[PDB]
Amino acid sequence: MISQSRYIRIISGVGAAAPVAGRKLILRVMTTNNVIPPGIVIEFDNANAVLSYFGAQSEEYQRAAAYFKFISKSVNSPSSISFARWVNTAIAPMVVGDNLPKTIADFAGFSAGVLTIMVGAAEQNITAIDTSAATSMDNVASIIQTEIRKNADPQLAQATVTWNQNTNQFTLVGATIGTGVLAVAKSADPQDMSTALGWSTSNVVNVAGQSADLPDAAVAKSTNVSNNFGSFLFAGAPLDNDQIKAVSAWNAAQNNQFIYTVATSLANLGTLFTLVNGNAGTALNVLSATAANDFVEQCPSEILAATNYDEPGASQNYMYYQFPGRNITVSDDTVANTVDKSRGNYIGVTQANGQQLAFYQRGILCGGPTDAVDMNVYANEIWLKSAIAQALLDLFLNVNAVPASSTGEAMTLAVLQPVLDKATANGTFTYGKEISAVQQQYITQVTGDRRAWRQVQTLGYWINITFSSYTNSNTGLTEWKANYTLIYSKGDAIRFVEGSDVMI
Amino acid sequence: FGSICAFTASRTFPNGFTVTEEFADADPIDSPPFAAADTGAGLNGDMVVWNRANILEVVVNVIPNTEGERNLAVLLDANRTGKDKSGARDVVGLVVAMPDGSKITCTNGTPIDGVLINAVASVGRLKTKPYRFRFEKVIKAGTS
Amino acid sequence: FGSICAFTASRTFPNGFTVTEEFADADPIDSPPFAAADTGAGLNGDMVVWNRANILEVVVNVIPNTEGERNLAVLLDANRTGKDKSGARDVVGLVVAMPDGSKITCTNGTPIDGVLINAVASVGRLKTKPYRFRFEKVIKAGTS
Amino acid sequence: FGSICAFTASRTFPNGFTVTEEFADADPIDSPPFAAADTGAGLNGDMVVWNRANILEVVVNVIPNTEGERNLAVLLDANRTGKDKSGARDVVGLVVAMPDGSKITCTNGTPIDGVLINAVASVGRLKTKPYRFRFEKVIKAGTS
Amino acid sequence: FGSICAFTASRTFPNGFTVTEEFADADPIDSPPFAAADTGAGLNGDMVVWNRANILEVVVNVIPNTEGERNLAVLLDANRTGKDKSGARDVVGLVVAMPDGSKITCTNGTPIDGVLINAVASVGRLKTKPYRFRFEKVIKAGTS
Amino acid sequence: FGSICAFTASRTFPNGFTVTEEFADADPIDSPPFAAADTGAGLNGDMVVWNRANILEVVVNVIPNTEGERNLAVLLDANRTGKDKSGARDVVGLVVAMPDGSKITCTNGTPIDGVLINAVASVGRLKTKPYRFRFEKVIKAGTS
Amino acid sequence: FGSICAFTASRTFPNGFTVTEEFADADPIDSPPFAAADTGAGLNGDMVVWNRANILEVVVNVIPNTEGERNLAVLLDANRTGKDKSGARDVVGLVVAMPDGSKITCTNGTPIDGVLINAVASVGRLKTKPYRFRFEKVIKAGTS
């Protein structure tokens, strides 16, 4: 009889939800674990995937378990995380691209006439390798390693072959460190390890000899590979003050695109604030010296990742969030006052009506007066910039041409209008805020048109577009551009309450 | 004289289309007066005032056989109600570019009125097309 | 100028007839505006919109004494209500061929208005015949 | 131009009388438009149609002082309602002979409107007489 | 041209008075149309007719300052309703003699409309006087 | 041409004032028609008549900037109702002297209509002032 | 000819703004007639009168693109009701300076009518802006 699942199929006990329904910023972690190859970025949609890939003992799983286990004021969860590799020390050339679960011990029968071809600087080959016994994959790796050692080539003289159980990757590390390029090609010999081993099939990652690089340069390569993240951090041991300052300056070079979260002690908090004064986009979180790490630096990242900007009411404040896993950092008013001068965030404890309450006390970012001090406005600006850029690129991609005339301006405004409607719906845009004389003068200065401050007071925003001509640097040819200006208001929030009780 | 209108639709015309033929003896881009408040006078001369609620209304006349008119007819037929036809619920947007700047943008709206087929007048010429619209939010960005 | 209308009837004129005399100072092939939606604005500025239901309407004026006018009168008299006369319930169809292609076809319809007998005006000429109609579905096959 | 009307009455004018003076600036032999059906459109675009009931109506203007006008006045006065006067309930018939054949006959009818006494206009001339009528059955014998 | 009207009142003017100045641009001796019957059509085409009841109405315009106008004003003031004034209930009679015989007589009637005081127009002349009337019985003795 | 009006008020103008500027293209000293009776006709032709109750109404147009106009404005403002102002309840009287005698006197009355502030027309001139009135009793002492 | 209007607002324009472009073929500074009393007449001729309550109304037309028109548009948009916008509840005042003195001042008022966006007429020119107003108290300091 037919299995009856051919017509109606019902699965019970899993109930997986829809993967993606909106736009969400996600955390990026720069780790020095040797498992991840330097040149790739890996995204995990669930904590169990991190557990399987890295292992239970790894600190990455410890971070991921805390990160995925978070519920915001609205019932939301991050649902995504990404990892990148930082090359802390010098690395020898390696070849690893093997993700297929081929380690079913199906290597017997390939013993006869092995001829693996390696395309290095100078090509060299390997004689027949006997893997008929195939007692274990470790033994097969050792037999392969010995036949690599048989060569007199400096790279292959002391090359090593390893194996990892949790993943399914076969790795070879060159004998020389600092410089070199190693690669393999697929041969036509039927008894070749090119197909038997993972190398030279579909995706294989080739990494050349590399010297140690600074973290500021390290994060740039990761951003070049992919930029689908927000609020990155550095894992492992804490960085030096100069390295932190350099990364902060690099982040400030980008204009309101990412947040840098760093964990510091009470002693070092005063010193860092002097160096990282200004440099918008940097968050300082105080670390407790009497307990475990607790990953306090991840506190703003989780709040950012939980937000869904497609839904109304997305915008939210950062000054009251309870993290049961985290521990207490400060408990005195004078210590809190000293920390607040340095614009540091922490978890503070207080008692009200016999109940102790602990929450993320502050949401202040270090930066200049022109920059957005609060975290919520910074995140809203990030989302707004991303949406506007995406809309403009879509308009360019889906039209024959955009004339340098009034028609082009009308087209560009029409494309941008729905994004502005969504921004008003989210809570990024607020209406009815009173405008002072200084702000009125600034608005009339930025936009030559007067009475625009009236519109930003009433409706809450103002936008206009013009076109002009310029010449690019690469060629002497003249081209045309467009310019637009957007003014909007920042919302206020209540964070302190005072009252008086009078009896008769 | 150099006046254009760019229409966009969320589903039918995601990228939008432009109309430039505004027709001869009809009034293009017409808007009825807007009522904003009402008053009442009580006995002994007291006056009370309250705010009324209304939305912006616009109508544009076009040449019987032009690309913009054909696109407008396509939009109206897409949103229309009929015996056996799918109804695409889409919100329309309009931006008007006048000579000497003065851009005006309307965000949320829908078609209201139209004429299904062409009609010939007594003189022997094709008649024009009303194509009424209504909108919710209006922003003026060209006071300069 | 080169405009014709072919009328078909379910029972009276199964093979149909053609009319070409569209008359001089009346409006031939006239169509009233078609209302498609209605709106309302609640307190605090919220806007709500719903779809109205309507059908296409067409009226054609003809010369008092012509073959097309006589066929139209025959069609109207068959469906009319009267003291002692059979009423043939038939569905009518109309296709309009304009110069430069642009065929327009209406499927389900019925006669509504007419003038029973000829009337003479003050100047001494015979008067015009309105012959109103309404239809259910309209399809346009005149993209060319 | 060569148009005549023969009026017959069951009681007052059993043999009938003829009228030929159709007056100058008013419209002789006028007939309002006739409505034959009504329609409604339900939700989802369904269309329903039903037949309305109506009768033929005709009005003829005449010279103030002529034999036909005097006979028409006699008929209206005979059927009229008054303080102390007999009311003769009679049915009227009308046959209209047009140039080039085309006879039109109306069978059952009654007078409805009129003007009781002559009136003088501002210019100094006598005014015309409306003399409205309505009928039940109409037959056309003017195929030629 | 040689038109004369004689008015009689049972109490105010037992012997009657005559009016000959019929004024220039207004309509003297005007009479609205008279409705005599109404009809209804039932389902399946049956027609039913009934008689309506109405009375004769007449209005005459006169020169602002003439003896006939003064007598008409006296009559209207006598029959009028006012704060403290006697109201004489009298029935009026009217006979109109046209050129070439044609006497028309109205028996029972009363005044309805008038203008109390003289009014000056924009050009600088006195305005005319409507002086409406209604009557019950009318007899025509002008067969000649 | 030689027409004057003397207005008197019981409280505001006990001795009265005179107005002589009657203005150019408006109608000075206008009076609507007066209805005095109503009638009905029952079945079988019986006629019944009853008296209606009405009062005299008069309106006078004046030049925008004259002494008479200013006095009329003062009277209207005195009698008017407002937020915080005393209301003087006074009875007004009017006597009109026409060329060749013919005095007309109205005893009990009150202002009804007016225009609060001056308005400018399109051409660039000040606009006219209606100043409507109504009265209770009218007596004519102009037999001569 | 030398006429100006100074507008003040309690919140939007605390110091006020002036308007001088009154536009050509529309009527600037127009005011409808004001009704102040009503009357009734009882049986036997008794007359009763009572005071009605009303307020002053004014409307001013302006050139489509001028500073005064832009300020008026700003005021109307500030007070208007909309989807998501603050509503500033402010009272407006108007003083009108005419040639040869004659100042007129209105104290408490509010905007009522306007046109949201500019419209183009058939001839190809921008259309006018009505900008209606109403006020509670009016004082005249123009005796000179």
Author numbering:
A (entry chain F): 1 to 504
B (entry chain A), C (entry chain T), D (entry chain E), E (entry chain C), F (entry chain B), G (entry chain D): 1 to 144
Structure paper excerpt:
Bacteriophage E217 infects Pseudomonas aeruginosa and is part of an experimental phage cocktail developed to eradicate P. aeruginosa infections in Galleria mellonella (wax moth) larvae and vertebrate models. E217 is a PB1-like Myoviridae of the Pbunavirus genus characterized by a ~66.2 kbp genome, significantly smaller than the classical enterobacteria phage T4 (~169 kbp). Here, we describe the structure of the whole E217 virion before and after DNA ejection at 3.1 Å and 4.5 Å resolution, respectively, determined using cryogenic electron microscopy (cryo-EM). We identify and build de novo structures for 19 unique E217 gene products, resolve the tail genome-ejection machine in both extended and contracted states, and decipher the complete architecture of the baseplate formed by 66 polypeptide chains.
We determined cryo-EM reconstructions of the extended and contracted E217 sheath at 3.1 Å resolution (FSC = 0.143). At the quaternary structure level, the extended conformation of the E217 sheath consists of a helical tube of ~205 Å in diameter that has a regular pitch of 490 Å and rise and twist of 40.8 Å and 31.3°, respectively. The extended sheath is porous, with visible openings between subunits. The internal lumen is ~75 Å and houses the tail tube (described in the next section). Stacked hexamers of the tail tube protein gp32 form the central tube of the E217 tail. Six copies of gp32 assemble laterally to form a hollow hexamer, whose internal lumen measures ~40 Å in diameter. The interface between gp32 subunits is stabilized by 11 hydrogen bonds, many of which form between residues exposed by the extended β-turn. The interior surface of the tube is mildly charged, with two charged patches, one positive, exposed by Arg125/Lys127, and the other negative, formed by Asp27. Before genome ejection, each tail tube subunit contacts one sheath protein generating an extensive interaction surface stabilized by two hydrogen bonds, one salt bridge, and 99 van der Waals contacts. Notably, tail sheath subunits do not contact each other in the extended tail but are solely connected by the association of their C-terminal β-turns and N-/C-terminal arms.
